[PDB]
Write a protein that binds this ligand. Structure first.
Ligand SMILES: O=c1cc(O)n([C@@H]2O[C@H](COP(=O)(O)O)[C@@H](O)[C@H]2O)c(=O)[nH]1
Ligand SMILES: O=c1cc(O)n([C@@H]2O[C@H](COP(=O)(O)O)[C@@H](O)[C@H]2O)c(=O)[nH]1
Lengths: 219, 218
């Protein structure tokens, strides 16, 4: 599994290249893994991955929540890995063929797939939550090794950890701005994803350092 | 939305030169292009403005938006800034995620299309069982534009029943995935067609042929 420094992944969802680069640079001593999603990519282009690699050397998880038919999923994964992403996040709710398409490209290209199981926001309760245990079980059956589950629902995160086993890698968004607790979340997740409570802080480095201090016994 | 010939081109070629050339070859037949991540991630969001400059076609950004509300708002803002007229949003992540997109679309003078059931086999696993409820949710939220599957006309018909005849319904899966254009247009206002056109030996002839096969429906 990837070795995530300080069990902390920055969600870099600022949409301005200069701000995104500044903040990431300021927290680089604390974090060696950055999640780049569509807010930044659709604003600044896929080259932003290259620019982060050039500037920081951080691992890059492309949070693209891939959610199309197998044919299109393959093309998205190819484009994303060609651009230099280490890993891509894929939705499980569109089913096994759609996930398999992503796994096939990742295998061919020597990269990683993360399977998003349950989501952290309130709306996740409407449809995703009821499917999430089965989505995780499907992931295990397909050979998925990396997963995403919600900090906002520790009870659900705990169940998802059980399903995927202790050897699987699990990352978790929702701590901070969405109300999740870093320490509680790290009982189950290998690493926490944190966005706004770092990148909107007056001092993002201090914010990251503070989170790390609060979980220091867990490192 | 008024779609010429009830035919929306899914431009999923990844090379700018090829995408522009093939679109140009079929431009007389369409006035609506669906641009997705295969093209956008290969050539950048500037491709949308380029299509508008060259073709003056309407642009549907097929981004299958499927994040939390905060992120969905950012995605929609970036997408509409690039000149998309509409965006396709998944319903499976729930009402708040859809509402986030509706809010931005209203602010920027654009449309949201709600994807209910998908066309591929894996849609049967989780999406199909939720799809009627996703459609009802769309109705409750005031969604007027929907996407459902050419590959399952009984499901497409049910989706039409739920949303009513006043709603606008577009449908992928005709051609390459096995759907039939004419049958699909019994229920959908327009069909989305990708590979059957853009991978054809002669894309213009492929488009012309499809339109000929549905001429009585135009
Ligand atoms: O269930 C999920 C899955 C996610 O990827 N995310 C992502 O994780 C990040 C959370 O950021 P924040 O710490 O600002 O709430 C965002 O990039 C969001 O898109 C999430 O919030 N919930
Ligand atoms: O359920 C759906 C929803 C889609 O947007 N699509 C999209 O519609 C297009 C179908 O292309 P094609 O005609 O080559 O099968 C692709 O861009 C695909 O991503 C789909 O196939 N099924």
């Amino acid at each position: 599994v990837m070795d995530v420094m300080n069990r902390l992944i920055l969600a870099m969802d600022l949409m301005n290249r200069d701000d995104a680069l500044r903040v990431t640079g300021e927290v680089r001593e604390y974090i060696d893994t950055v999640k780049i999603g569509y807010p930044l990519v659709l604003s600044e282009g896929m080259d932003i991955i290259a620019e982060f690699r050039k500037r920081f050397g951080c691992r890059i998880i492309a949070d693209f929540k891939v959610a199309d038919i197998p044919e299109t999923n393959e093309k998205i994964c190819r484009a994303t890995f060609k651009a230099g992403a280490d890993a891509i996040i894929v939705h499980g709710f569109p089913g096994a063929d759609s996930v398999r398409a992503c796994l096939n490209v990742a295998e061919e290209m020597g990269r990683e797939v993360f399977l998003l199981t349950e989501m952290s926001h309130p709306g996740a309760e409407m449809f995703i939550q009821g499917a999430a245990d089965e989505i995780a079980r499907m992931g295990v059956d397909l050979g998925v090794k990396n997963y995403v589950g919600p900090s906002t629902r520790p009870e659900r995160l705990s169940r998802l950890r059980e399903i995927i086993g202790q050897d699987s890698f699990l990352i978790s968004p929702g701590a901070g701005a969405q109300g999740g607790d870093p320490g509680e979340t790290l009982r189950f997740a290998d690493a926490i994803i944190v966005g706004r409570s770092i990148f909107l802080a007056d001092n993002p480095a201090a914010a990251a350092a503070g989170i790390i201090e609060s979980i220091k016994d867990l490192l």
